Each structure stands twice: as structure tokens, then as C-alpha cells.
Design an enzyme around this catalytic site. Structure first.
Site, short mmCIF file in Angstrom:
data_model
loop_
_atom_site.label_atom_id
_atom_site.label_comp_id
_atom_site.label_asym_id
_atom_site.label_seq_id
_atom_site.Cartn_x
_atom_site.Cartn_y
_atom_site.Cartn_z
N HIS A 51 -14.31 7.47 -11.17
CA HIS A 51 -13.72 6.41 -11.97
C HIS A 51 -12.52 6.88 -12.78
O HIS A 51 -11.83 6.04 -13.38
CB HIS A 51 -14.78 5.79 -12.89
CG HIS A 51 -15.19 6.68 -14.03
ND1 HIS A 51 -16.08 7.73 -13.87
CD2 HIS A 51 -14.85 6.67 -15.34
CE1 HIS A 51 -16.25 8.33 -15.04
NE2 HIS A 51 -15.52 7.70 -15.94
N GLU B 285 -7.60 9.39 -24.98
CA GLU B 285 -8.71 9.07 -25.88
C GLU B 285 -8.83 10.09 -27.01
O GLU B 285 -9.43 9.80 -28.04
CB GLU B 285 -10.06 8.98 -25.14
CG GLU B 285 -10.11 7.90 -24.06
CD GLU B 285 -11.51 7.74 -23.48
OE1 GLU B 285 -11.65 7.85 -22.25
OE2 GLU B 285 -12.46 7.52 -24.27
N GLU C 248 -19.12 14.04 -22.63
CA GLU C 248 -18.15 13.60 -21.64
C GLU C 248 -16.88 13.21 -22.39
O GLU C 248 -16.62 12.02 -22.61
CB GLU C 248 -18.65 12.44 -20.79
CG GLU C 248 -17.70 12.08 -19.66
CD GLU C 248 -18.13 10.87 -18.88
OE1 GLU C 248 -18.18 9.76 -19.46
OE2 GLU C 248 -18.44 11.02 -17.68
N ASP D 227 -20.70 5.71 -11.33
CA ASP D 227 -19.94 6.80 -10.72
C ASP D 227 -20.92 7.91 -10.39
O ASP D 227 -21.25 8.74 -11.23
CB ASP D 227 -18.84 7.28 -11.67
CG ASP D 227 -18.01 8.40 -11.08
OD1 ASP D 227 -16.90 8.65 -11.59
OD2 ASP D 227 -18.45 9.05 -10.10
C1 LIG Z 1 -15.52 8.92 -22.38
C2 LIG Z 1 -16.72 8.40 -23.16
C3 LIG Z 1 -16.62 8.78 -24.63
C4 LIG Z 1 -17.76 8.28 -25.48
O1 LIG Z 1 -17.79 8.91 -26.78
C5 LIG Z 1 -17.72 7.93 -27.80
N1 LIG Z 1 -16.91 8.46 -28.89
C6 LIG Z 1 -15.54 8.54 -28.94
N2 LIG Z 1 -15.07 9.09 -30.03
C7 LIG Z 1 -16.22 9.38 -30.76
C8 LIG Z 1 -16.41 9.99 -32.02
N3 LIG Z 1 -15.41 10.42 -32.80
N4 LIG Z 1 -17.68 10.15 -32.45
C9 LIG Z 1 -18.68 9.73 -31.67
N5 LIG Z 1 -18.62 9.14 -30.47
C10 LIG Z 1 -17.35 8.99 -30.07
C11 LIG Z 1 -17.18 6.67 -27.14
O2 LIG Z 1 -17.61 5.51 -27.85
C12 LIG Z 1 -17.80 6.78 -25.75
O3 LIG Z 1 -19.13 6.29 -25.73
#
Ligand SMILES: *CCC[C@H]1O[C@@H](n2cnc3c(N)ncnc32)[C@H](O)[C@@H]1O
Ligand SMILES: *CCC[C@H]1O[C@@H](n2cnc3c(N)ncnc32)[C@H](O)[C@@H]1O
Ligand SMILES: *CCC[C@H]1O[C@@H](n2cnc3c(N)ncnc32)[C@H](O)[C@@H]1O
Ligand SMILES: *CCC[C@H]1O[C@@H](n2cnc3c(N)ncnc32)[C@H](O)[C@@H]1O
Lengths: 343, 9, 343, 8, 343, 344, 8, 8
Positions: E281, E133, E124, E32
Site C-alpha cells: 500500500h 508523516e 510502523e 496489505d
Molecule cells: C503509519 C501509521 C502511523 C500510526 O501512528 C499514529 N501516530 C502518528 N503520530 C503519532 C504520535 N505522535 N503519537 C502516537 N501515535 C501517533 C497514527 O495515528 C497511526 O495510527
């Protein structure tokens, strides 16, 4: 006390014959050049069936068919018409200097008296889907004035039915019915009437034409032989059908059309309202299923079309159809008196 | 409450 | 009863059969001007409905009764003579308003109400306002109205204005001239041309038009539903004297109607005028048998006399003349069978 | 003919 | 017993982080160019916010944002990722000779331990419709490591919503639900589940793009300030709205998109997913009404959008909207975790 | 506590049954006319196996198969379903006026209780490549409710293996992975992850269909007889093969499909997902070799496909193959739980 | 991943 | 049931 009044609500007959009193409605049928030209073709090409003959014209309207009989050499023509159009017909007889051969007799064919038996009966008893108007029973009733071995124009009638697929038509009618699906139309919940709305809209036969590509099987024929049938035969018409699907897809209903045959002494002339033929004012008739049936090419769709005559001069139609391989089954009721003129 | 014969052309 | 004494049974049957169809309810309900304005008039005058007894004459699906409940009505009696009353009951139940909306099937002239009401609501307007003769049932219902009670609508105004439409006038003869041919399939039809012409001129034309065809300020005949009796509608004489704003051939009179809901808080107007957005009432025009030339500044005087008949409609007699020239024309029309020319 | 014309 | 595990069901987390362990999903986001280019622009154009500063990268995936921060001269970057993608981030840090500046710390940001407080957090955290999420709460949670004078990249998020008209999309979804309308699927009556089917299909948010001409009113904006907001603020999100309809027609639902702003010291850089902008995206998100509301130009469509966070890392969305002028009201729920990808 | 839980990670089961709680997923299967039609014909055309019999329906979903059993004249049908779809099946049993003949039992067949033994078990336990979902084990587990001479519909299952050539499918893997082979993606060198990207794509079995002309040898068949097999027989599935090449070219992997047979008293009905048959929602499955193997017409391609059950309701796939005439060898390891749906 | 692939 | 929509 007459056969007509016992099988007909007065209220229906009043509006029925009022409709046929209008000259514009005569023009509407007369401008149908397929219908008028084919009628003249059948009579004149079979002039031997009229030359110096006695004729009865049941429901003559303005009398066009009696004039065709006169052109073919008829000795005397009794033109029976129950609407006020009989007056205009008499005017035409006198203005065309045919008083010596066309005798207009106002009234219902079940109630008037004729001075003699006739050699041949002519009429246009066909409504849309053939059977609407119940004029065919009047046409058959008039056989009491027919000599033995007397002919009839038309002589037979072929009703054709075939399954069709038309998702746009199904959606057009389903969308109309989904108005009663709104839970807050100006704040009011209509959804409770949703079901009754669907019933009403899908009881309406759809009167218009269509491309023949929408048909999914060879048509099934149902023949009425007007020389043999009794008017009692049209009180309860049962048309079994067993279609052999030629294409796979959704069957949204059955399409209907009819042909009549003028079986004269010189040739047989056919008047067809099929979708493969040029359009007539009868169009074609399609009955919609509330839910389409899914069928595969090579499947058989079997069922029955039961037409029960009502006293509003029409029929209540029940169509039950099932895909034999899957047992998928569709049952429908139609009010042939409340059509949806879509064209 | 419709017409017996459909309008045409 | 009052209703059956002024109505042929054949007309009443077909009339209520029409209103038994949910599709016809839908047709009126989808008219946003109609449905929205009624809702607006009732809600914006909530004090006229809050904790009040209401009568709904010809409720159909019951939409106006639901509006009265939205405005806080204590008790609503909804009367409907067609089988649509059964569907109103269903909606009352599904909207949890059984304690407040009592549906009464039958004619308002024949049913029985248990108590007088504070305000009567109804939609008794047909095309040209007076068709259907529902205004007499609306006025007849005042036998249930408490003194100093109100009516929604409160007054009705029918507007008459002269128009010029050369195309409209000439198309009558274009249609009738089908009969003016000496050999339609060998038949001479010219003798019926005059009857065809007359048949078309008896039909009021129901459609819309550009307001630029109007040639004078309209004349207004008001019916005050609070004061009038149903006898005032058996014979409606509407004198007119138009001050011609434009010069041209006057081919007839154009008809529309406004209606007012005179509430304690405000007055709301529902208008079918051609200067307003189109409604399902459209407008109605009645032709003169012959056009009248009128210079800008002349006066076109005459009378439009509506005579009620037992077909739930009126016979329309129109006479008009250009005072400055003395040129006269007239026409006699059957409002029950108009021509829906709208495309 | 219909009391209320068809509308859209 | 971390903040994450208290608000998150494990079965949701296992599947969630498994998805983000796939390099193919990193490629999908990285390709993207609007998303990746704008992030690099926001960081490099605001290099002073990074030069010789301590950075926290929350949810770094493969580490791209950490590399951008290193390009801007960051002294030390802690890159936290809970998925197995953290091991791939380590490989890139070594192969890019940045072991001395980017320290990958695997785990959830709610559970790891950082050696020091940071000057700026980059992340992000935006899912489709922004809030899906619930990664925003982890982003806000990470502020425990942020210095008092610290900054957030992104700094704010704007959620926009506007009513749309899209009869085709509505019919498309309703056609799928109508499978459960059949009364004889292989001889089995499914109609009893018709209601549940419609509910299921219409609780799905539609994720795709559309032409801006389907929008019927100016969008309303809901802003989250990441510098000021706290985790608990995102448990219950209530977005009231009052739309002034610019066009008449059927309101089939509300469309959603989001903007984030990187409010740096040198310049503010915006990343927009608006349908007036190049496609990302994230696309846009539309919530369909089970029955569209009809509105006129100039009406007001008012209501509320209520997002209740659930333990499946998403929100149960409630949307209630009404056309004020008529009281037409629509209530809808949507399972933000079960979207329909339509593109 | 139960056989099902002992062999299934909780997180896999939650996701698995939430999926089947959706009417859209029931609809997706029911609309497969080959699937739904063949089950109906298998049941109706063997009406003597169902008339006045007692039936167990394992994983009934919306109950469609139980209605076919009623249409065949069954007296009592116990319809077990573990997803929330069980509640939707109960509504259909009532609305179809069959509450006296069909009894929905919500729960896992390994955990619920049945009041009596049944004469016949019906089920749709087939996942893609037959074995995915590990529903065959629940199907065999259900035999504890089957009478000594009871039947099972389906009665047997055949998985078919065949080598295929598809140069474009093979090269597509590196075309996708080569996204990572650039030295400055926005200033970042991604090339160190290219190998990892390749490995990730090759671990995905490919779910779609293909022209039968890409098959280069007659298929080998591995049969499960559901009347005789035990649950433990499906924990380790070893499928040896010795393909006699019909065409010369590069072998890029193995293609998979399956047939089931309903062996009734009146007739045997077959449901086939082969590439020679009309397409079903199971499609076919292909597993690439890491390197292609050149084989001439007449050569033998021998090896083994080993499927090892895992606790994610699927299998780890080990494929090893060599061309005997040359010794050229290749292998691959694939995760059947995470396929690539390539069909367009 | 979906246990059953999308069909038609 | 994917968090991020497939792009392009
Ligand atoms: C949209 C991409 C999100 C990105 O962040 C990671 N993620 C999601 N939640 C998380 C927590 N609680 N701690 C660390 N990383 C975390 C996802 O895996 C993704 O790579
Ligand atoms: C399709 C045109 C029918 C035609 O016949 C007239 N009609 C209908 N029913 C009739 C009876 N019973 N007797 C005489 N004429 C009759 C219609 O008026 C129309 O002209
Ligand atoms: C214009 C809509 C009229 C509406 O009222 C009903 N109606 C007509 N005449 C009626 C009488 N006398 N009593 C009760 N209802 C009556 C029509 O059926 C229509 O619904
Ligand atoms: C392929 C369709 C499988 C079908 O069966 C249900 N299912 C799966 N595993 C189950 C166990 N152990 N008990 C009962 N039902 C079970 C799936 O939910 C799906 O409906």
C-alpha cells in the site's frame, strides 16, 4: 513588366520553375492515376468539346493534357509551359508524330503571344489546398485568349473545409515545439523562444490524409467559377463558415480539400481530393489551432478563413473561429508555402 | 522552403 | 562584397530563408554527436577560451557562443546573416549574457567587428563538407583573427572511398524506365528515358550505408583552416589512387568528412564517417555512369574535381579507371540538388 | 533541397 | 508545549489523526498482506527478543503489532495511539483476553507517560517515501523510554532513488497543466496562469507502481539507523546522488522506494516496497521534472535531494540533478503532502 | 471576531481553503460544462441585470464568474475570495485587461470591506447536497452589501429528497464491515469491532449517480429563497416528507439532489443536478437507512430529515422514517463532512 | 475529504 | 490529502 513578374518575387519564381524542370516531378504527378486518368476521362468522354477545336494548355509540363486533347480530335493545341520541361514536351510531340497539332510555346502564359484565340483552355492549376502556387491566376489570365462562350477544363473548383479532432496530431506538433521549452539544453535556457517555436510549427499546414471519422461537422463549400472569375478575385479570398457540430469534443482545427469539375457537352466529370475518395498526390490539408476549442454537439462554430496572396506564389492564411454559445475563440495564421509533409 | 507538389507513392 | 560577388541572389534568398526556421536549428541541435562534440571540444580546451575574444561565424541560434561563455570567454561576437540572429539576441538576454555575447546580424563578409579576436568558432560544414560554401566565409573571417590565433574547427578532412552497391545503381534505371513505355495513357514516353537516366545520375545520393560496401581504404584531402585561404576552395582537385581490398564492380565513390578541434589542452574529433554513429550530415555517394570491375589488389586511380558555383555549391567532376585493365568511367554531378534517399 | 538533411 | 506540538501545526494534526480514527483506514493497511505478514514474521521469528520483555508499540492503531508481540510471549506491552483508534484497540484487547499484557495508553508518544522503561520499541512509522508523516521522529522520540541495551523494530530504513524514463506519465501531467494554456476558455484568457499550473502539477509526487524496466541506472541508497539516529537528524535530510546511466534516453525524474529491516537476535527480516517486489500500500513515489534531461549510456547524473521538514507533518523536497557531461540541469520542488494517487 | 470565525473551527477552515488554493480544483469545477456553461448563459442571457451595474462575486475563485459579468457589461465587479486563489484571479484580471472593472478583494466575505453597495450578487455557494461547505451562509451574509431592490444569482435553491431501493448498495456496507468478522486475523479475533465498522460505513452519505428507476416516490422539495432567507435559517434545516410510494419493495434510504434558479429580468435559467439531467461534479447524494423499510405501492413513507449545522463547515444529518401502514420505523445519523465517493 | 468531488 | 494510499 508582365502580370506574373509584378506579383512574383524573382527568387520564388526561379526555384518554382526549377522544380518543374525535373522529369522526376513530372513522373510524380503522372503516376497519380486518379489525377491523370480522371483528366483523360474528362477530355475523351467530352470529345465533342475538342473535335476540330483550337486549344490552349496552360502549364502543360510534359504535355500529357495536350496529347489527350489530340486524342479527342483537336485541330491545333498551343501548349504553354514556363519551365524547361517545355523542351521535353517538344521531344514527345515529335516522337509521337503530332507536330501538326501540338505547338509548344515556351514561356509564361502572361508573356507569350498566340496567333489566334482558342475555343477551350485546359490546365492543371490546382496546388495543394487548391490555391497554393497561384497558378489559378495564370489559368484565369489565359482567358484573354479565349473566344466568347469558350469553355475551360476544369470549369469550377470547390474548396471544402470542415472542423476536425485529432489529439495525436496536435500532440505530435506540440511536442516538436516543446523542444524550445528546455531551460537547460546543454546548459542553455531556450524557454524564451518557446512562444516563437509554437508560432512557427503551427503556421505549417499539415499535408497528409486522415480517416473521415475525425470530422465534426458537415463541410462548408467555397466555389470558384473559372469561366467568370477574374485573377484579381484570388488576391484576397474570404471564406466565411458556420459549422453545426455533429459531435462533441475538441476541435483541433479545420481540414481542407478541393474538387474541380470538367463541365463538358457530353457529361460533367469530377476530380475530387476529398478524404472520402481515393488518395491523390494533393492529399488533404489541415490547419492546426495552437489551442483547441471545446464544442458540444449542436453548437455552431462560426468564423472566417482569409487567404491573402503573397509574392512568393502562395497565400498567408488567417483563420478565426469561435464557438458561438461560449464565446470560445481561436485565431491562427498559416504560411501555406511552408507545409509539413507528414504522410 | 518546400516543394509545390507533394511526393506521392 | 565578397559574398555577393560569388553568390546569385536567388540562391542566397532561399539559403537564408531555410536557416531562419527554428525547426532547422532544432534539427542540428538535436544531433547529439554534432552538438555534444562541439561542446566537448570547447569546454575541454577551456584555456583557449578563458578571458579570450571569440568570433562565432554563422552562430544560428547561438549555441556555440553559449558554449564559449561556459568555457569562460570574455567577449563573444556572434555573426549570423539569417533572421535567426534575432532569436539569438533573445536567448542572449534571457541567459543574462548581454555583457559577453554581442550578436551581429548580417554576412561575415559585410558586417564590421570592432576588434580582432583570439579564436574563431563556427560550424561551416555542409554535406560532403564543402556544400553551402560556408568554409569560405569561415576562412574569410580570419581577417579578424589575431596572429597566432586559433580556429575551432582547426582542420577538415574529406574522405573518398570506392563502393559497390548493385541495388543503388540499378534503381536509377528502374526509376527512369517509367518513361520507357510506348503507350502511357496513349502517349509514347520512351523518347525521354535517356533524359530521365541522366537526371538521376547528376544527383549525389545523401544517405547512409553499411561499411562493408567499401572496397578500399579511403583517400583523405585535408584543409587546414589556419593556413588556407578562401581562394583554395574555388577549385578543389582531389587525386586518388585506391588499393582495392575487395574484388567486384565499383559503382562510384562514397564521401564523408572529419573535422578536428586542435586545442591547447587536447584535440577533439567530430566524424561523420560510416564507421561512426550517424549524424545529420549522413554520407554522400556519387555514382559512376558505368561500373568498373576491379580485382582485389588493383589500383583505381583518377581525380575528383569540385568546381565552386554561384549557387553556394559545387559541380562535381569524377574520372576513374582501373589501371590494370584500362577500363574507364566518369560522371558529372550537381551537389546543390542531391537525392535524399535515406529511409 | 535543404542544406542540412532532415535528421532524427 | 510538547515536542510534537512545537513541530506540528494543529490544523495539520487534527486532520491527520481524524484520518487514522477510521476503521476503514485500518482495514486498508491490515489487508496489505505483505505489510502485515512481514511484521508478524519479523516478530515471531525473533520471539526471544520479546519473550518476557517489556514492549512499547508506537502508533499502534488497532493494536495488531501489540498482539504479535503478545504472541511472541511479551510480558507487558504499552500500546500508544493518539487517534480515537485507541478506543478500538482497547475493545480488541479485552475481547482477545489480553488485558493482563497489552495496556493501551491513548495520546501522543511525545506527551503520554509510561510506567517503566522498555526493552524493545515496535512501530510502523513509515509513510510513502518513508519520511512523509514525520512519524519517524515520534518513533525516535520514543527512545527516551528505551533501555540502553534495547532494540528497535524496525531497526533501519533504506531509502532508494533511481532515475526513470516515462514519457507517458510526463505527458499525462503536462496535459492537465495545459488546461491553463487556453487563451479563450468561455472567452477568458487563462494563459497567464499556465506557468503556475505546471508548477502546481509537477510539485505533486506521483504515487503508484511501475515496471522496473523504466529505471535507467542502479539506485542509490540512503540509510537511517533508528537505533542511533536522533529526532533532529530528520529536520534536514540531504541525499546526494551520482547515477551511472545504464541506458540512453530522457530522464523524466527520480523514482523512490524504501526498505526497512527488523534486525533481531535470531534473524533479520526485511520489508521492501521496491518495484522488484510484490506491491504494498506504499507503492512507490516518483518526482517528475518539469523538463526531462537527456542522458547517454555511460553519462553521470549527479545532484542532491534535500528534504526540509515542515510543520504540516511532511517535507518540502528539493531535487537538483544534472547530466555532468553536458551541464543539462533540472531544479524541482515537491510538496510531499500533496501527492497524486495514480493507480 | 467575525461571523465566519464564530461558526468555524480553525482547523476546518485551514484545510477547506488550502483545498481551494489549488488550480487543479478550479479546473475540476470549470471543466464541468453544465456548471460553467449554465452560469455563463444565466448571466449573458440576462445582460440587462448586469449592464452598467455593480456586482459582488462571493468566493470568486479564479474569477471566472466575474468575467462573465464583465462580458455582460458590468461597470464594477468586486470579486471576494478567501483562499490563495485570490492571487491567481488578480493575474487573470490583469492579463485580460480588466483591471478597471474587476477588483479582487482577498479575504472572507464576512471580514473584508466593500467601498460601496452593489446591484447584484453572484456566487457558486452550492456544495454537494446543496448545503455542504456552509457557503450559502456567506452568500446570505453578503446581502449586507446589496441594495434594497438588488438581485442574487442564483436567486433560489431547491433540494430534492426521494426514497430509493438499492439492495446492492445496502449489502455492500456489511460486505466491507465483515472484514472484521473473523476469529483469527493473523491470530487476532477482530469480530468485536464489526459493529463499529458497520456504524462507520452507514454514517457516510454516498456521493455518486444512479438510475432514476431506483426512485420509488415523487420527490419532496425544500426551497431556500436567497433574496429573503437569513443566515440563521440554515443552522437548523428541517425537511418533513410524506412519500406516496409508486412501487413496492424495500426502501434502503433517501436520495438527494438540488437545482438552483437564476431569476433574471429577461428570463429564468436553471442549473439542475437531478439524476434525470446530465451529470455534474456534484453528482447526487444518498443516505442509507440502518434497516430497510418494506412499503407497498400506495403506502406512505413519512418522516423528517433534519440537518444541523456544525463548526466543520457541514451538517450532521438525522433521518427518521416510518411506513405509516405498518409502523415499521428506521432512522440513521450521517456526517455530511465525510462522504463516501463511490462513483467509478 | 474534498469539498468538491473529482469529475471526469 | 490522505497519509496512506488506498490499496487494492
Ligand atoms: C503509519 C501509521 C502511523 C500510526 O501512528 C499514529 N501516530 C502518528 N503520530 C503519532 C504520535 N505522535 N503519537 C502516537 N501515535 C501517533 C497514527 O495515528 C497511526 O495510527
Ligand atoms: C500544377 C502544375 C503547374 C504547371 O504549370 C507551370 N506553370 C506555372 N506557372 C506558369 C506560368 N505563369 N506560365 C506557364 N506555365 C506555368 C508549372 O511549371 C507546372 O508545369
Ligand atoms: C552550416 C550552418 C551555417 C550557418 O551560418 C549561417 N551563414 C551562412 N553563410 C553565412 C555568412 N556569409 N555570414 C554569416 N552567417 C552565414 C547560416 O545561416 C547558418 O546559420
Ligand atoms: C463552492 C466554491 C466556493 C468558493 O468560495 C470560497 N469561499 C468559501 N467560503 C468563503 C468565504 N467565507 N469568503 C470568501 N470566499 C469563500 C471558496 O474558497 C471557493 O473558492
Amino acid at each position: 513588366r508582365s502580370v506574373f513578374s509584378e506579383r512574383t518575387e524573382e527568387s520564388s519564381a526561379v526555384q518554382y520553375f526549377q522544380f518543374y524542370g525535373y522529369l522526376s516531378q513530372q513522373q510524380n504527378m503522372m503516376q497519380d492515376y486518379v489525377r491523370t486518368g480522371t483528366y483523360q476521362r474528362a477530355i475523351l468522354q467530352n470529345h465533342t468539346d475538342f473535335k476540330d477545336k483550337i486549344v490552349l494548355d496552360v502549364g502543360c509540363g510534359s504535355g500529357i493534357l495536350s496529347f489527350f486533347a489530340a486524342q479527342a480530335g483537336a485541330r491545333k493545341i498551343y501548349a504553354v509551359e514556363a519551365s524547361t520541361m517545355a523542351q521535353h514536351a517538344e521531344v514527345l510531340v515529335k516522337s509521337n508524330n503530332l507536330t501538326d497539332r501540338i505547338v509548344v510555346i515556351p514561356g509564361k502564359v502572361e508573356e507569350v503571344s498566340l496567333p489566334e484565340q482558342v475555343d477551350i483552355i485546359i490546365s492543371e492549376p490546382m496546388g495543394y489546398m487548391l490555391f497554393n502556387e497561384r497558378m489559378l491566376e495564370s489559368y484565369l489570365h489565359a482567358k484573354k485568349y479565349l473566344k466568347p462562350s469558350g469553355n475551360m477544363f476544369p470549369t469550377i473548383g470547390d474548396v471544402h473545409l470542415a472542423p476536425f479532432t485529432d489529439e495525436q496530431l496536435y500532440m505530435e506538433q506540440f511536442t516538436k515545439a516543446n523542444f524550445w521549452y528546455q531551460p537547460s539544453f546543454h546548459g542553455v535556457d531556450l524557454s524564451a523562444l518557446r512562444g516563437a517555436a509554437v508560432d512557427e510549427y503551427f503556421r505549417q499546414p499539415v499535408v497528409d490524409t486522415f480517416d473521415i471519422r475525425i470530422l465534426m461537422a458537415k463541410s462548408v463549400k467555397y466555389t470558384v467559377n473559372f469561366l467568370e472569375a477574374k485573377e484579381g478575385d484570388l488576391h484576397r479570398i474570404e471564406i466565411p463558415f458556420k459549422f453545426h457540430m455533429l459531435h462533441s469534443g475538441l476541435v483541433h482545427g479545420l481540414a481542407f480539400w478541393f474538387d474541380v469539375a470538367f463541365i463538358g457537352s457530353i457529361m460533367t466529370v469530377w476530380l475530387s481530393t476529398a478524404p472520402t475518395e481515393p488518395l491523390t498526390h494533393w492529399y488533404q490539408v489541415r490547419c492546426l489551432f495552437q489551442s483547441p476549442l471545446f464544442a458540444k454537439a449542436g453548437d455552431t462554430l462560426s468564423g472566417t478563413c482569409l487567404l491573402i496572396a503573397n509574392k512568393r506564389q502562395s497565400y498567408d492564411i488567417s483563420i478565426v473561429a469561435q464557438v458561438d454559445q461560449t464565446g470560445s475563440k481561436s485565431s491562427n495564421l498559416l504560411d501555406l508555402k511552408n507545409p509539413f509533409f507528414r504522410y | 522552403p518546400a516543394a509545390p507538389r507533394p511526393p506521392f507513392s
